[PDB]
Amino acid sequence: MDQYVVFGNPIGHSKSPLIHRLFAEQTGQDLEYATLLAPLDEFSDCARGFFKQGSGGNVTVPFKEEAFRLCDSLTPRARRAGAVNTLSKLADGTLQGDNTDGAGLVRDLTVNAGVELAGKRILILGAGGAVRGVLEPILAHKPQSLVIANRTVEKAEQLAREFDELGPVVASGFAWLQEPVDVIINATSASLAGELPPIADSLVEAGRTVCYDMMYGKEPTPFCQWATKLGAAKVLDGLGMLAEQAAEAFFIWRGVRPDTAPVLAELRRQLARG
């Protein structure tokens, strides 16, 4: 039977085994999915050990960059992302890395939440691997503009440089942002601890601007609270992205697309329990 894991640390409370087990039941796939705790400094060793017999695995933060360096081959979107969240063993025994995070984000935004991206003004906050992993699929939807803003503008400038040829992406310091936009995407890890950037209230036009946090928790994130208080038209966290990036990985592995809606329904029911 084919074996899959989620690599992580800590990984005890992972939702991924439930998610992929439900996918597998839905789509009649004969596989097992478990957690694999990797010591924070021994990820590559753990992955090599697993892939002696294993078929694939998801890779969680903080291991996505190391996974990018470990792979024998990379998909084009993983190459552009500089980060791998999905590992697959090929028939010749080599290890291939993909990145489904961007696909998951844009699918959740456009299909699940019905948010239009084409012709719109998009702002993304941050400039790490989280941003690099989603720029390409956002630009593929042909926005009017995609602004990257970050604490240190040089990191944003470097990202804009890498994706310049793919669309109207530009970097900006926060001091220049004031006009409302259509969509604000938060990609800053530090924001969970309250380090929000110095963004103006005016970026949110009440009843128009959509705010999407790539982060999620049981409770609304600081960014989500900020957006809600300003009357954003829709306020979302990263739960749908989690489900959709997983579904995309499942498809990469198995060649069938599972239905995420009843899986998200179960995840939300469990969150409601609290």
Keyphrases for this structure?
19% strand, 274 residues, NADP, Shikm_DH/Glu-tRNA_Rdtase, 6-stranded parallel β-sheet, 37% helix, 6-stranded mixed β-sheet, Shikimate dehydrogenase (NADP(+)), globular, Rossmann fold, 11 helices, 12 strands, alpha/beta, 2 domains
Describe how the helices and strands are arranged.
Elements: E1 2-8, H1 16-26, E2 31-37, H2 43-50, E3 56-59, H3 64-70, E4 73-74, H4 76-81, E5 86-89, E6 95-98, H5 101-112, E7 121-125, H6 129-132, H7 135-139, E8 145-149, H8 153-163, E9 169-172, E10 183-186, E11 210-213, H9 222-229, E12 234-236, H10 239-254, H11 261-273
Helix pairs in contact: 1-10, 5-10
First-last Cα distance: 35 Å
CATH architectural name of the largest domain: 3-Layer(aba) Sandwich
The largest beta-sheet arranges its strands as: 2-1-3-5-6-4
CATH domain topology of the largest domain: Rossmann fold
Count of helical segments?
A: 11
Instruction: State which percent range the strand residues make up.
Output: 15-25%
Number of strand elements? 12
User: Using only CA atoms, what is the Rg?
Assistant: 18 Å
Largest sheet: 6 strands, mixed
Measured as a percent range, the helix fraction is 25-40%
Outline, from the CA principal axes?
globular
For the record, the CATH class of the largest domain is: Alpha Beta
CATH-assigned homologous superfamily of the largest domain: NAD(P)-binding Rossmann-like Domain
Secondary-structure element order, N to C? EHEHEHEHEEHEHHEHEEEHEHH
PDB class: oxidoreductase
Keywords: Oxidoreductase
Assembly: monomeric
Entry title: Crystal structure of shikimate dehydrogenase (AroE) from Pseudomonas putida
